[PDB]
Design a protein around this motif. Structure first.
Motif, PDB file in Angstrom:
ATOM      1  N   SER A 195       0.803  -1.210   0.000  1.00  0.00           N
ATOM      2  CA  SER A 195       0.000   0.000   0.000  1.00  0.00           C
ATOM      3  C   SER A 195       0.844   1.272   0.000  1.00  0.00           C
ATOM      4  CB  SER A 195      -0.957   0.003   1.180  1.00  0.00           C
ATOM      5  OG  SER A 195      -0.232  -0.036   2.395  1.00  0.00           O
ATOM      6  N   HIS A 196       2.092   1.188   0.463  1.00  0.00           N
ATOM      7  CA  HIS A 196       2.966   2.357   0.476  1.00  0.00           C
ATOM      8  C   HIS A 196       3.214   2.902  -0.927  1.00  0.00           C
ATOM      9  CE1 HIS A 196       3.475   1.754   4.722  1.00  0.00           C
ATOM     10  NE2 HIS A 196       3.817   0.496   4.506  1.00  0.00           N
ATOM     11  N   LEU A 197       3.238   2.012  -1.917  1.00  0.00           N
ATOM     12  CA  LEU A 197       3.402   2.435  -3.305  1.00  0.00           C
ATOM     13  C   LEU A 197       2.227   3.315  -3.734  1.00  0.00           C
ATOM     14  CD1 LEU A 197       2.767   1.803  -6.595  1.00  0.00           C
ATOM     15  CD2 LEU A 197       5.166   2.023  -5.902  1.00  0.00           C
TER      16      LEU A 197
ATOM     17  N   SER B 217      -0.050  -2.847  11.073  1.00  0.00           N
ATOM     18  CA  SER B 217      -1.160  -1.913  10.997  1.00  0.00           C
ATOM     19  C   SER B 217      -2.013  -2.107   9.745  1.00  0.00           C
ATOM     20  CB  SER B 217      -0.657  -0.482  11.075  1.00  0.00           C
ATOM     21  OG  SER B 217       0.212  -0.211   9.990  1.00  0.00           O
ATOM     22  N   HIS B 218      -1.447  -2.701   8.694  1.00  0.00           N
ATOM     23  CA  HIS B 218      -2.205  -2.939   7.471  1.00  0.00           C
ATOM     24  C   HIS B 218      -3.404  -3.852   7.709  1.00  0.00           C
ATOM     25  CE1 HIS B 218       0.826  -0.730   5.330  1.00  0.00           C
ATOM     26  NE2 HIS B 218       1.764  -1.497   5.858  1.00  0.00           N
ATOM     27  N   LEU B 219      -3.267  -4.786   8.647  1.00  0.00           N
ATOM     28  CA  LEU B 219      -4.376  -5.667   9.000  1.00  0.00           C
ATOM     29  C   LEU B 219      -5.540  -4.855   9.567  1.00  0.00           C
ATOM     30  CD1 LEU B 219      -5.897  -7.552  11.400  1.00  0.00           C
ATOM     31  CD2 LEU B 219      -5.225  -8.705   9.277  1.00  0.00           C
TER      32      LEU B 219
ATOM     33  N   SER C  62       7.502   4.412   7.037  1.00  0.00           N
ATOM     34  CA  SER C  62       6.511   5.424   7.356  1.00  0.00           C
ATOM     35  C   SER C  62       5.782   5.148   8.669  1.00  0.00           C
ATOM     36  CB  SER C  62       5.514   5.568   6.219  1.00  0.00           C
ATOM     37  OG  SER C  62       4.832   4.344   6.012  1.00  0.00           O
ATOM     38  N   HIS C  63       5.751   3.889   9.108  1.00  0.00           N
ATOM     39  CA  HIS C  63       5.090   3.551  10.364  1.00  0.00           C
ATOM     40  C   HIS C  63       5.731   4.256  11.555  1.00  0.00           C
ATOM     41  CE1 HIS C  63       2.659   0.738   8.165  1.00  0.00           C
ATOM     42  NE2 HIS C  63       3.748   0.190   7.655  1.00  0.00           N
ATOM     43  N   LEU C  64       7.041   4.479  11.483  1.00  0.00           N
ATOM     44  CA  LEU C  64       7.740   5.207  12.539  1.00  0.00           C
ATOM     45  C   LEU C  64       7.207   6.636  12.641  1.00  0.00           C
ATOM     46  CD1 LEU C  64      10.344   7.236  13.392  1.00  0.00           C
ATOM     47  CD2 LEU C  64      10.154   5.037  14.580  1.00  0.00           C
TER      48      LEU C  64
HETATM   49 ZN   LIG Z   1       3.785  -1.005   5.950  1.00  0.00          ZN
END
Ligand SMILES: [Zn+2]
Lengths: 21, 30, 30, 21, 30, 21
Positions: free
Chosen positions: B9-11, C9-11, E9-11
């Motif tokens: 999803s980051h893409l 977190s994607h879940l 990006s989670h950080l």
């Molecule tokens: Zn991620």
């Protein structure tokens, strides 16, 4: 393609821009 | 700007920001 | 719909979308 | 459980739906 | 609160929540 | 540093708080 390149390697924002409409 | 390591999803988050209202195509290899 | 590879977190983002106002439980193995 | 399955393997949106309230 | 495994990006999402209006510095090793 | 610790190991919210302004 771009999806695979960005994940397996790295990619630039300019490379991504090729996918804008 | 810097180079990016983008998976999943980051893409699509990145495409969203780069393209804005232009929109974009997300086209993974099949 | 397609199958998903979802970690971290994607879940919870996915549960949020699937369940909407129904809400959900996030219950990792302990 | 579902959290582990989705991350180590893959899971469907229908499997996730079992966790809706 | 629990410990976290945070990459990419989670950080920054985590810093955003922890710090709120205080703001924060994101400073990766170079 | 903190960025590397959180990704290679784990980190707490209190450790992250050291980076608030
Ligand atoms: Zn991620």
């Amino acid at each position: 393609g771009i999806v695979e390149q960005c994940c397996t390697s790295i990619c630039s924002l300019y490379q991504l821009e090729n996918y804008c409409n | 700007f810097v180079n990016q390591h983008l998976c999943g999803s980051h893409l699509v988050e990145a495409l969203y920001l780069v393209c804005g209202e232009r929109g974009f195509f997300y086209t993974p290899k099949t």
